[PDB]
Task: inverse folding
RNA sequence: AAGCUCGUAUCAGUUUUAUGA
RNA sequence: GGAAUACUGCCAGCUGGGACUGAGGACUGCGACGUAAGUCAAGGAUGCUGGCAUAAUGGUUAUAUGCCGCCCGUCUUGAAACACGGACCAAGGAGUCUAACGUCUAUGCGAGUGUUUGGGUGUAAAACCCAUACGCGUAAUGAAAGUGAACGUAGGUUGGGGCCUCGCAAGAGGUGCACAAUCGACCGAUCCUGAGGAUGGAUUUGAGUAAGAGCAUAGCUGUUGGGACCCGAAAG
RNA sequence: GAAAUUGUUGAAAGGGAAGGGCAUUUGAUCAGACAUGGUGUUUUGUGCCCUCUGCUCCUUGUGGGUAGGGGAAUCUCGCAU
C-alpha cells in the first residue's frame, strides 16, 4: 500500500493549523487596530499643536493688552524645571549627596525633570552648587525625548523609538504615543509622576560649544555654571544633547 | 534565590529538567512551588510521616485530593486507619509504601503527578516539621 | 533508556570524544553524521539514527531503528544510493520520510561532501607528479654531513 | 537592534508622530500671523 | 552565607507643612 | 509719517565639506511612498573597481627618535621615611597528617540505623556474605521517694505558600501545608484546703506532649591537643 | 649537557648611568599554496549502466552482497578522454 503520517505528527499539523489560523486572524485584527490607533494619535498631535500655538499667542496678547491698558501682566509661574548634574561623584557632603540620588542624578551630566512645588524648591536650594537647573522650552523637551529618551520597563533602560512601547506601558494613564508623553512633561499633568518616572534619567554629553565660563563652579549670576539659569538652560541642554 | 540543585542524583536532575519546562509553559504557580522545592537541601526537605498525610486528609472537602510530598514519605506504626488516597513523593519507605497500598490508595512518583496533574489540579503540598 | 545513556556520556565519559582547543567535542563513532558530538547528533545517545558512509566507492545510507536495541549485531540497516546526485538526493528523501529535519538535510549533506571526496580520482588521474615525500631520518642527516666534512 | 534617530532620518520621524507629514505640507513652523 | 514571610507601601544622611521650649 | 535691519528665539527649512564605525545574519515588526502593482533612506553595508605567487603582505630581533617610567621585598609609625633582606645562577625549601568535637552540603536507609572485633568465603592484605551483641536515636515531668501525656478533625480563633468555584479580566468566596499570633487543655511540678494527704479550689511553670528525624559514610571547613605553617633564645 | 659565568668572532650602541612602557622608522632576518579548479554543453570509450540468465545472507520494504553473456544506433547513470 502506502506509508502514513505518525499519530503525533498528524496531531502536529492539526494543532499548528489551530494556532496558525488563530495567529493569522489575530495579526489581521491588529493591523486594523493599529491603523485606527494611528488616526487617534494623528488628531491628538493636531490638537496639541493647536493648543501650544494658542497658549503662547495668549501670553503675547496678554502682554500687549497690559501695555495698551497701562497695566502690568504677571506671567504664569514656571511649574517645570530641568536639573542637570554639574559636579562629579567625589568630595560631596552627605546632606546634598542623598538629595542628588533622590533626583536620580547619580553620574555627572545626568538630567531629569522636577515638578516645582513648595517642597522641591528647597531641595533645589540644597543642591545649588552641584547642578544647573532652568525652565525648558517645548523644543528642548522634544529634542531630549527623541534623542536621549529611554523607558524603564520592569528594570531595563529600553529605547523608545516606537509608539507601541509607551502605549503598552503607560496606556493605563492615558498616554498612548511619544508626543502624549511630551505633553505630560511640558504641561505638568495629573500623571506627571508616572510619565517622568517612566523616562530614564537622561545621559547627556559634555556641551558641544563648551561651558562658556573659564571656571564652572560658581553661581551663574557671577560668571559660573551652577544654580538657576531659567531660559539659557535651553541653549545649554541643546549643546549637551 | 536558588538556581540549580546541589544534588548529583541524575534522576532528580531529570525531574528538575521536566519541571523547569512546566514552570514556564504552564504559568500556574503550583509548578513554580514544586520546582523551587526540588532545589532544596536534605535538611530543608524533612520527611513527611504517613501520620501527617492522615491529619491532612481530615481537612474538609479534601476526600478526593492527590497529596504531594516533595521530600520523603515515612511509615508510622502508631496509627491504624488510613484513607484511600493517591500520594505523590520522591521516596516512599518500604513500610509507608506497604501501608498506602494495603489501605487501598496508590503511591506514585512526581513525574506521574506531572502527567495526572500538569497545572496541578486538586492537589495539596505538605511539608515536614523544620523547627 | 536513552536520556540516561546521554547524561552518562555527556559528562562521566563518552570514551571516544576529542576535546579540541576550541572547547568543541567530536564523537569518532564511525556512524555519526556531524563529526561533532551533541545530543541526538551522536549515534549512541539517540535511538533513531541515520547516516551516510562509504565502504568502497558505493555510498550506503545506514539506518538505526529502536526496534533493534536488543540486538547490536544487525543495528544498522543499509541501502545503496545509486550514483547520480539528483536521483540519490531523491532516494535519500524517501527513506527520511516522517523523521527529524535534522537527519533529512544532514544525510543529504553527508552525501554531498562524500561525493565531492570523489575529487580523489581527479587528483589520481592527473597525478604524474615528479616529487614524492621523502623522510629525513636523523642518522642519514649525519652520514651525509660528517662524511662530507671528512671527504673535503 | 540599533537606535535610528528622528529629527534626522525622515522615515523614522513618520512612524513616530504621523502628523509630521501634515506639518511638512503646511510648513507650520513657517507660519504668518 | 543560608532558611523563613514577603515584593512591598518596606523605607531614605533630603525638602515641606503641622505641633513645643 | 513711512519701511527696514541687527538682536533673541523657532523651523517635523534647504544644500554641501571631513573623520570614525558597518556591530547583526532566511523571512516576521513599526512605517513611508505608490490608484494599484509594488518599491523604499523603514527591526545595524551594500554595489562596482584595482593591486598577486620570484607575490601581496605579516612578524622577530637589533638600535634610533618623541613622550613617559624613584629599587624590588619585609617591617614600623599618620603616610615619605629610617631599618632589616637582596653578588649572580641551578636545585632543594614551608598550613601537613591524626585524634577528639562540631558546621554545612552530598549519598544510603529511615523509627530506626551502623557488614569489615570477629566468623564464612575468595581468582587472596582486595571483593563477596553473616551470627550473637553493642553503639546512637526512638516518650516525658522531678531534689531523696514517683507518675505519665485525647474535653479534642491531638483545638478555638486569626492569619498564612498553594489548590478549588465564579469572573475575559480585575476581584470575591471556600479549603487551607509549613510556620507565626492569640485562647487553652492533658501530664508532671506549684499556694492552700487536711480525708498517713483524701478532696476542692489558687495560679503559673516546662530543649513537656502538640501527631518521631535520626544513624552512617563522604566532601567542604572550624575549634583544641598533638613537633602542628617553616626557622631562629637564655636552659635544667 | 640547562643557567650563572668566560673567551673568540660577527652585528649594534656609548658627551658624568643602563635596563622598562606606548609608537614608528632604518639595518639584519624569517614567514608567504606537490593551491589549479568550478559550472554548462559536445565527441566517444568503459563500468557497479541498459538488457538476458543467476546465486547468496537475512528481516518487511523503502533490504544487502556477489556470477555468466550481450549491447550502445539513446543516455549522462557514473567514470574516464
Result:
Amino acid at each position: 500500500e502506502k506509508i502514513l503520517t505518525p499519530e503525533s505528527q498528524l496531531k502536529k499539523s492539526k494543532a499548528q493549523q489551530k494556532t496558525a489560523e488563530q495567529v493569522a486572524a489575530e495579526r489581521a485584527a491588529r493591523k486594523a487596530a493599529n491603523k485606527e490607533k494611528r488616526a487617534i494619535i494623528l488628531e491628538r498631535n493636531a490638537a496639541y499643536q493647536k493648543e501650544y500655538e494658542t497658549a503662547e499667542r495668549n501670553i503675547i496678547q496678554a502682554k500687549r493688552d497690559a501695555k495698551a491698558a497701562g497695566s502690568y501682566y504677571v506671567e504664569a509661574q514656571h511649574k517645570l524645571v530641568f536639573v542637570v548634574r554639574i559636579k562629579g561623584i567625589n568630595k560631596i557632603p552627605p546632606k546634598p549627596r542623598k538629595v542628588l540620588q533622590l533626583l536620580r542624578l547619580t553620574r555627572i551630566n545626568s538630567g531629569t525633570f522636577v515638578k516645582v512645588t513648595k517642597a522641591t524648591l528647597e531641595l533645589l536650594k540644597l543642591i545649588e552648587p552641584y547642578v544647573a537647573y532652568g525652565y525648558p522650552s517645548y523644543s528642548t523637551i522634544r529634542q531630549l525625548v527623541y534623542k536621549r529618551g529611554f523607558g524603564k520597563i520592569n528594570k531595563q533602560r529600553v529605547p523608545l523609538s516606537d509608539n507601541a512601547i509607551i502605549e503598552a506601558n503607560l496606556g493605563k494613564y492615558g498616554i498612548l504615543s511619544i508626543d502624549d508623553l511630551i505633553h505630560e512633561i511640558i504641561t505638568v499633568g495629573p500623571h506627571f509622576k508616572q510619565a517622568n518616572n517612566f523616562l530614564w534619567p537622561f545621559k547627556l554629553s559634555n556641551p558641544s560649544g563648551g561651558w562658556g565660563v573659564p571656571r564652572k563652579f560658581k553661581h551663574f549670576i557671577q560668571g559660573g555654571s551652577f544654580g538657576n539659569r531659567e531660559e539659557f538652560i535651553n541653549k545649554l541642554v541643546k549643546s549637551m544633547n | 534565590h536558588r538556581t540549580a540543585p546541589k544534588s548529583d542524583n541524575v534522576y532528580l536532575k531529570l525531574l528538575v529538567k521536566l519541571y523547569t519546562f512546566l514552570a514556564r509553559r504552564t504559568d500556574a504557580p503550583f509548578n513554580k512551588v514544586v520546582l523551587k522545592a526540588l532545589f532544596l537541601s536534605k535538611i530543608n526537605r524533612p520527611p513527611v510521616s504517613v501520620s501527617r498525610i492522615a491529619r491532612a486528609l481530615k481537612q474538609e472537602g479534601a476526600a478526593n485530593k492527590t497529596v504531594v510530598v516533595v521530600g520523603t514519605v515515612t511509615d508510622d506504626a502508631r496509627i491504624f486507619e488510613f484513607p484511600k488516597t493517591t500520594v505523590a513523593a520522591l521516596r516512599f519507605t518500604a513500610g509507608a509504601r506497604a501501608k498506602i497500598v494495603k489501605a487501598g490508595g496508590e503511591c506514585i512518583t512526581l513525574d506521574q503527578l506531572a502527567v495526572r496533574a500538569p497545572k496541578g489540579q486538586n492537589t495539596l503540598i505538605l511539608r515536614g516539621p523544620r523547627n | 533508556s536513552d536520556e540516561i545513556v546521554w547524561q552518562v556520556i555527556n559528562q562521566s565519559f563518552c570514551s571516544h570524544r576529542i576535546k579540541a582547543p576550541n572547547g568543541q567535542n567530536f564523537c569518532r563513532n564511525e556512524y555519526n553524521v556531524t563529526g561533532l558530538c551533541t545530543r541526538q547528533s551522536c549515534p549512541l545517545a539517540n535511538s533513531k539514527y541515520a547516516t551516510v558512509k562509504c565502504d568502497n566507492g558505493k555510498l550506503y545510507l545506514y539506518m538505526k531503528t529502536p526496534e533493534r536495541a536488543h540486538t547490536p549485531a544487525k543495528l544498522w540497516e543499509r541501502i545503496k544510493l545509486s550514483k547520480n546526485y539528483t536521483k540519490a538526493l531523491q532516494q535519500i528523501d524517501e527513506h527520511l520520510l516522517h523523521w527529524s529535519k535534522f537527519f533529512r538535510h544532514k544525510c543529504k549533506q553527508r552525501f554531498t561532501k562524500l561525493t565531492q571526496v570523489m575529487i580523489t580520482e581527479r587528483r589520481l588521474a592527473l597525478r604524474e607528479e615528479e616529487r614524492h615525500y621523502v623522510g629525513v631520518a636523523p642518522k642519514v642527516k649525519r652520514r651525509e654531513q660528517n662524511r662530507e666534512r671528512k671527504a673535503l | 537592534v540599533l537606535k535610528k534617530n528622528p529629527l534626522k532620518n525622515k522615515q523614522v520621524l513618520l512612524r513616530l508622530n504621523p502628523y509630521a507629514k501634515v506639518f511638512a505640507a503646511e510648513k507650520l513652523g513657517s507660519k504668518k500671523a
Q: What stands out?
A: Residues 1-241 of chain A form one domain.
